[PDB]
Amino acid sequence: KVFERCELARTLKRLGMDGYRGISLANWMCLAKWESGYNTRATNYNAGDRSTDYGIFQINSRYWCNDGKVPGAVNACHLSCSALLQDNIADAVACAKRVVRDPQGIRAWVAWRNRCQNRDVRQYVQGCGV
């Protein structure tokens, strides 16, 4: 599924993402936007280490979900990577929360650091009623 901006914002808010560990909704939106263009079936293979980025938040199988094909990997979110490819983003949100429960917080995603950190992200939620 490819979410429309405000559609995703309300969806994320309903799933309890607004302020989760101090992270505003606009940050989560800026992340999903640059990570997958709001596409839940987005995937990006990394030939370098054989891992794959899954879903709307491009969560990596080397560490977060199990897909059984990375020679040496862990499954910190305790989910099959398939779970991160559903139109329903609840499981992906549960994993996204798990990622930020670690020290870096929202900084886990390099894309967030380069394209959202210290930026005006209001644009991502304006007019969405969130």
Curated annotation (Swiss-Prot):
Q: What class of enzyme is it?
A: hydrolase
- UniProt record, GO biological process: antimicrobial humoral response; defense response to bacterium; defense response to Gram-negative bacterium; defense response to Gram-positive bacterium; inflammatory response; killing of cells of another organism
The active site is formed by E35, D53
Principal localisation? secreted
Q: List the disulfide bonds.
A: C6-C128, C30-C116, C65-C81, C77-C95
What is one Pfam family matched by this protein? Answer: Lys
Q: Where in the cell is it found?
A: Secreted
Any one GO MF annotation of this record: identical protein binding
Q: SUPFAM superfamilies attached here? A: Lysozyme-like
Instruction: Name the Enzyme Commission number(s) assigned to this protein.
Output: 3.2.1.17
Q: Which UniProt keywords apply?
A: Amyloid, Amyloidosis, Antimicrobial, Bacteriolytic enzyme, Disease variant, Disulfide bond, Glycosidase, Hydrolase, Secreted, Signal
Reactions performed catalytically? Hydrolysis of (1->4)-beta-linkages between N-acetylmuramic acid and N-acetyl-D-glucosamine residues in a peptidoglycan and between N-acetyl-D-glucosamine residues in chitodextrins
What Gene Ontology terms describe where this protein resides (cellular component)?
azurophil granule lumen; extracellular exosome; extracellular region; extracellular space; specific granule lumen; tertiary granule lumen
Domain C-type lysozyme residues, every copy: 1-130
Other comments? Lysozyme C is capable of both hydrolysis and transglycosylation; it also shows a slight esterase activity. It acts rapidly on both peptide-substituted and unsubstituted peptidoglycan, and slowly on chitin oligosaccharides.
Hey, which family's this protein in? Belongs to the glycosyl hydrolase 22 family.
| Known disease link | Amyloidosis, hereditary systemic 5: A form of hereditary systemic amyloidosis, a disorder characterized by amyloid deposition in multiple tissues resulting in a wide clinical spectrum. AMYLD5 primarily affects the viscera, and the predominant clinical features are renal dysfunction of varying severity, and intra-abdominal bleeding. Inheritance is autosomal dominant.
> Can you state the subunit structure given in the record?
Monomer.
The record's function comment reads: Lysozymes have primarily a bacteriolytic function; those in tissues and body fluids are associated with the monocyte-macrophage system and enhance the activity of immunoagents.
What is the name of the protein in this document?
Answer: Lysozyme C
Lineage of origin: Eukaryota, Metazoa, Chordata, Craniata, Vertebrata
Question: Corresponding gene?
Answer: LYZ
